[PDB]
Amino acid sequence: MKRKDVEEKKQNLDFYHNYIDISKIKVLQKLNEEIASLNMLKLQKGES
Amino acid sequence: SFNPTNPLKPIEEKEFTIFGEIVEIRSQVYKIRIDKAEEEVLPKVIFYADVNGKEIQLEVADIFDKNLVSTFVLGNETGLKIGTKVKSKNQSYAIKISKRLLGRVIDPIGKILDDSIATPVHGNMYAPLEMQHDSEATRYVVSPKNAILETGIKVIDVLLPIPKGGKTGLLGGAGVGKTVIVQELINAFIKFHDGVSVFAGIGERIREGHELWKEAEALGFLNKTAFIFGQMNESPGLRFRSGISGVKVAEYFRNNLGKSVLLFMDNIFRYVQAGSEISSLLEKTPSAVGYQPTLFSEMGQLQERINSTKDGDITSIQAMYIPADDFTDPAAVAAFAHFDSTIILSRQLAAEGVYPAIDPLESNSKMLSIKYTSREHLDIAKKTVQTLEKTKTLEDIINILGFDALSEDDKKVVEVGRRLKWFLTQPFVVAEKFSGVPGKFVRLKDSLKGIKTILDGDLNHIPVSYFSFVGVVEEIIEKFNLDAKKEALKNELEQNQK
Numbered sequence: 001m002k003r004k005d006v007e008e009k010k011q012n013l014d015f016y017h018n019y020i021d022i023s024k025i026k027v028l029q030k031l032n033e034e035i036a037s038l039n040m041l042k043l044q045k046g047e048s
Numbered sequence: 049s050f051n052p053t054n055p056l057k058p059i060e061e062k063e064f065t066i067f068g069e070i071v072e073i074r075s076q077v078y079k080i081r082i083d084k085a086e087e088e089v090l091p092k093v094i095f096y097a098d099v100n101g102k103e104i105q106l107e108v109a110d111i112f113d114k115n116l117v118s119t120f121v122l123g124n125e126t127g128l129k130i131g132t133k134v135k136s137k138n139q140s141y142a143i144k145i146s147k148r149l150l151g152r153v154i155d156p157i158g159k160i161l162d163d164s165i166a167t168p169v170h171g172n173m174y175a176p177l178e179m180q181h182d183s184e185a186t187r188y189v190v191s192p193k194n195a196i197l198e199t200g201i202k203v204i205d206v207l208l209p210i211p212k213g214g215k216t217g218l219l220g221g222a223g224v225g226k227t228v229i230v231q232e233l234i235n236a237f238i239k240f241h242d243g244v245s246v247f248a249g250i251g252e253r254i255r256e257g258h259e260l261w262k263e264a265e266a267l268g269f270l271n272k273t274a275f276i277f278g279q280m281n282e283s284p285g286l287r288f289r290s291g292i293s294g295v296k297v298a299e300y301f302r303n304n305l306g307k308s309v310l311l312f313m314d315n316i317f318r319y320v321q322a323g324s325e326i327s328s329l330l331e332k333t334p335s336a337v338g339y340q341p342t343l344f345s346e347m348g349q350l351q352e353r354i355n356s357t358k359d360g361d362i363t364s365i366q367a368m369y370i371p372a373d374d375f376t377d378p379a380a381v382a383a384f385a386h387f388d389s390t391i392i393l394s395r396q397l398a399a400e401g402v403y404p405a406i407d408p409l410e411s412n413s414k415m416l417s418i419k420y421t422s423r424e425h426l427d428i429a430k431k432t433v434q435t436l437e438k439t440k441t442l443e444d445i446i447n448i449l450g451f452d453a454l455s456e457d458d459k460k461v462v463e464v465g466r467r468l469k470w471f472l473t474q475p476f477v478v479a480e481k482f483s484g485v486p487g488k489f490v491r492l493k494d495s496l497k498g499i500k501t502i503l504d505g506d507l508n509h510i511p512v513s514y515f516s517f518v519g520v521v522e523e524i525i526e527k528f529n530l531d532a533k534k535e536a537l538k539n540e541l542e543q544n545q546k
């Protein structure tokens with residue numbers, strides 16, 4: 001139980017905290033792609 | 049026959065020449081003033097006293113003046129008062145050693161501990177504290193380690209090989225499995241050893257010593273083993289001398305009879321603890337964490353006598369206790385410097401059910417060299433440890449970010465790591481009482497083959513649960529095949545019924 005280990009743990013936690021924001025950005029982009037594809041699928045289904 | 053070149057010499061016959069009486073008392077520490085003496089008193093000599101025919105020995109620690117000394121008791125102090133008469137031969141404590149010690153259970157000062165009638169042990173008087181050799185250079189004529197013992201335990205045989213003629217240590221907290229591993233090593237080493245064995249219990253349970261003595265009687269290796277027991281119920285003065293007496297007995301059996309000695313010490317932390325208590329009772333300035341100033345010197349004074357010469361080998365297997373699971377403890381740091389092989393036990397692994405609870409990511413062995421093993425063994429061990437480290441790193445990512453964040457490589461790495469971790473567990477022969485699973489003995493090449501097969505990814509289809517507590521990988525394959533066959537037969541039967 002040394003300050004070095006606590007600093008390592010806190011830096012890992014902060015890195016994960018940033019990475020979760022990055023994952024949120026990626027998931028939002030994939031959601032936008034999926035919605036854009038689904039609109040076209042809906043129009044194709046109506047035409048069919 | 050065998051011609052000793054540095055044999056032990058029995059003590060010199062003497063008459064009581066120093067006389068005095070106790071002028072200060074305390075718990076375990078007494079001050080003696082000398083009235084009559086034909087010679088000046090020396091450090092570490094023994095003063096004897098008698099109370100109702102019971103003999104009490106006190107070792108000298110400090111010499112304040114020409115007539116005043118401080119002492120600590122070796123044994124029970126019940127009976128000592130102010131004015132008790134004490135006499136001394138100006139010699140340190142001695143025990144009777146001979147070939148008749150094998151099969152006998154004694155304590156550090158030679159009290160009989162295996163029968164009530166106290167059957168005497170014949171031999172000569174040797175002083176464990178007094179070590180005699182021609183010169184300092186004579187201490188540097190030692191043989192190099194050139195062999196590795198096989199234990200039958202997969203993890204120890206593969207990742208942490210145990211030297212022959214060296215020192216191995218088993219470190220861990222309370223109740224993690226040090227004594228079980230020591231007993232398994234005793235079972236797997238004695239009765240096949242070209243020599244004798246010496247066990248030294250230092251501040252351990254009485255029940256464990258009784259169990260080990262009974263097991264030695266039952267399995268037939270009692271007559272090849274010498275037992276010394278200063279246990280946790282004894283005074284600090286006795287727990288401080290158990291290791292010295294055990295080392296002296298091993299040195300007698302090596303130097304004087306040319307035999308290879310298997311030395312087991314448990315627990316080697318209690319020696320340091322007793323020395324610390326004695327130092328605290330003599331009112332000396334403590335070191336860090338309240339230890340004695342002479343901690344490293346005290347550890348070295350015992351550890352340096354366990355050496356291998358041309359007369360024979362002394363192989364030491366020692367259990368080290370970690371107080372409060374603190375591996376930065378000064379005693380642990382002092383002990384780390386002497387172990388050729390270090391095996392560190394984990395409480396979390398034991399909680400998960402991994403047995404033996406050996407942490408390969410914290411342990412190390414100096415026998416993993418090209419001088420002692422083959423290239424293939426080194427490569428397999430390095431790959432295993434690397435895979436376990438990578439798996440441990442990836443488990444945090446799995447725990448926090450979920451499982452789908454990993455790639456295909458990371459998932460395969462985790463699967464291989466889990467299979468490797470659960471394959472290293474093994475049922476111990478001595479551990480049949482705890483569960484009932486029969487013990488297994490796996491030789492080195494079978495362990496290497498199994499680990500190579502698991503590393504290659506051949507068994508990723510078999511569920512992890514099958515890998516725990518087996519012998520060779522063929523047992524895992526057989527269990528998987530039988531379970532699949534039973535499932536297939538049940539499915540065929542139910543489809544026939546429908």
Ligand SMILES: Nc1ncnc2c1ncn2[C@@H]1O[C@H](COP(=O)(O)OP(=O)(O)OP(=O)(O)O)[C@@H](O)[C@H]1O
Pocket residue numbers: 220221222223224225226227228229403404476479482
């Ligand atoms: N190989 C094993 N197989 C099964 N159970 C085990 C094994 N090793 C240890 N255990 C379990 O752990 C318990 C403690 O083991 P052991 O007596 O060896 O511990 P220890 O480290 O010597 O403890 P202490 O600090 O009290 O001296 C055993 O009673 C048993 O339940």
Ligand SMILES: [Mg+2]
Pocket residue numbers: 226227
């Ligand atoms: Mg124990």
